Each structure stands twice: as C-alpha cells, then as structure tokens.
C-alpha cells in the first residue's frame with residue numbers, strides 16, 4: 001500500500017513501547033501513557049483500530065490525521081513522533097502531556113485564576129495563529145483539546161477535525177464551541193480561521209466558568225441558539241477589563257468584525273506581564289491536588305502522576 005509505505009515506520013510498535021497505561025479514550029481507541037524502550041522516554045500513544053466493518057472510513061480518517069500531524073512544526077501544537085502499524089491498529093505516537101485544560105477544571109472543581117487563563121489562552125492563540133498563517137483551521141478548539149506538558153507549555157492537540165484549507169464548508173466541531181457561520185453550513189455556507197477565534201472565546205469562558213455557555217441545553221437546540229442569538233459573554237464583572245474585552249472581541253458574531261488570530265497576538269490580555277512560572281505552578285498545584293483526591297488508586301486523574309510510577 002502506497003500510504004503505509006509513505007507515512008509509517010516499519011518497526012513493530014510492540015517491541016518499541018512498554019508500560020502502556022490508558023490516559024484517555026478517543027474515537028478509535030484508548031490513548032496511552034508509554035515508555036519508548038529506545039531511550040526510556042515517556043510518550044503518548046493514540047491507538048486507532050481500523051478493523052470491523054467501518055474499516056475503510058476508519059483507515060481514511062487515520063491517514064488524514066497523520067498527514068496533518070506531520071506537517072506541524074510549532075511549539076504550541078502537540079509534537080507528532082511518528083506512526084506504526086500492527087494488526088489493523090495504527091499507533092500514532094506523540095510527546096506526552098500530563099493532562100488537558102479540562103482535566104485541570106475537573107481536578108479542582110474550580111475555574112482557573114485569570115493569570116492562568118491568560119497563559120493558557122496565549123499558548124493556544126499562538127498555536128492557532130501558526131495554523132491560520134498556513135491556511136489551516138483547527139475547528140475543535142475547547143479546553144479538552146488544549147494540553148499541558150512539563151515543564152509548562154500549552155499545546156493544541158486533536159487535529160481530527162482540522163481543515164487543510166480555508167475557506168472550508170464542513171458541518172464539523174463540537175456544538176457548544178461552534179462558531180455561528182460553521183453552523184450555518186448545516187445548510188450551506190463557507191468560513192475561515194476566524195471560526196477558531198470564536199471557539200477560543202468560548203474556551204476562555206469555559207476556563208473562567210468550568211463550562212461553555214449553553215452547556216445546559218441539548219446539542220441540537222444549542223446549535224440553533226448559537227446561530228440565532230446574540231453572543232454570550234463572561235458572566236462575572238470581577239474579571240479584568242482586558243479579559244472581558246478579549247472574549248467580547250473573540251465572540252463578535254459578524255465574521256468580518258471578529259479579529260484574526262494574528263491581530264489578537266498583540267491584544268493586551270495576552271501580552272500583560274505574568275510570572276514565567278504560571279503554568280509550572282498550575283501543574284504542581286494540580287499534582288498536589290490529584291494526590292489528595294480521595295481514591296487515588298481509582299482516580300481518572302491519577303494519570304497526571306503516571307510518569308512517577
């Protein structure tokens with residue numbers, strides 16, 4: 001097969017990686033914490049099976065994601081380390097991140113501090129401006145797809161729904177985070193990288209309030225709501241003016257009035273001076289809490305400590 005010869009390494013993954021532990025579950029299989037035997041380094045492995053009967057589509061999705069991942073070379077995007085094949089299962093290897101921003105919201109059962117939101121937002125934004133400068137669109141920006149890695153960098157992950165070209169016209173994304181002009185393709189229409197700026201605004205609210213607006217409504221009704229109603233905003237007046245302004249700019253409903261990710265890189269919310277260890281401290285803050293969550297042996301957050309086993 002042309003695609004296997006071109007995109008995959010020939011090694012048997014079973015010989016290269018060990019101590020696999022599930023750290024998540026995707027659409028094609030679990031995602032595992034693992035150690036590369038060649039250097040004792042921890043990695044993340046997304047196993048994607050293409051057996052069964054949906055084999056054709058499954059294989060097609062795998063290759064499409066691999067081709068996208070290998071194009072990426074930016075510090076705020078998840079590092080792709082290659083892929084392997086073994087018995088109808090493709091092993092996509094990536095640098096290992098200790099958790100997602102949503103895992104952080106789940107561990108503390110509290111929104112993040114504004115300075116932490118600014119740091120996470122800034123990382124995700126740099127990653128998005130990088131994709132957009134190459135005519136790509138992520139299309140699924142949300143806290144659950146933003147990963148944190150030691151020492152403390154924030155990276156965009158999950159390129160399963162990305163577009164290699166803009167403008168695009170596919171109904172894709174996760175309802176609560178979807179931009180209005182993407183929903184309007186449910187019928188017909190086109191859009192560009194600005195749909196990610198909208199999703200980033202919703203994600204900012206999600207980090208500030210633990211959930212995106214409309215999370216309390218079923219997905220289908222939410223879609224019509226997003227398309228028809230005016231934009232949501234941060235609920236509380238206690239956040240700084242810069243943060244409130246960043247979110248309101250991200251959530252402009254008229255696409256032409258919404259700024260590109262490139263322009264937002266210079267927004268004061270993102271450029272405001274903050275401690276260079278904000279993320280590191282957050283991670284540590286989180287590790288400490290995971291070790292305290294009662295039932296550490298039955299935790300779904302205990303993975304944040306897997307590399308210590």
Ligand SMILES: Nc1ncnc2c1ncn2[C@@H]1O[C@H](COP(=O)(O)OP(=O)(O)OP(=O)(O)O)[C@@H](O)[C@H]1O
Nearest residue numbers: 023024025026027031044094095096097100158160
């Ligand atoms: N590089 C990584 N390091 C650590 N954990 C990761 C990594 N990539 C993915 N994960 C974990 O695996 C699960 C994610 O992946 P992805 O977002 O890749 O899944 P999907 O295939 O999009 O599945 P879903 O739709 O359920 O999110 C995530 O929720 C995340 O916790």
Ligand SMILES: [Ca+2]
Nearest residue numbers: 167168169170
């Ligand atoms: Ca199309």
Ligand SMILES: [Mg+2]
Nearest residue numbers: 140144145158
């Ligand atoms: Mg995902």
Ligand SMILES: [Mg+2]
Nearest residue numbers: 140158160161
């Ligand atoms: Mg996905």
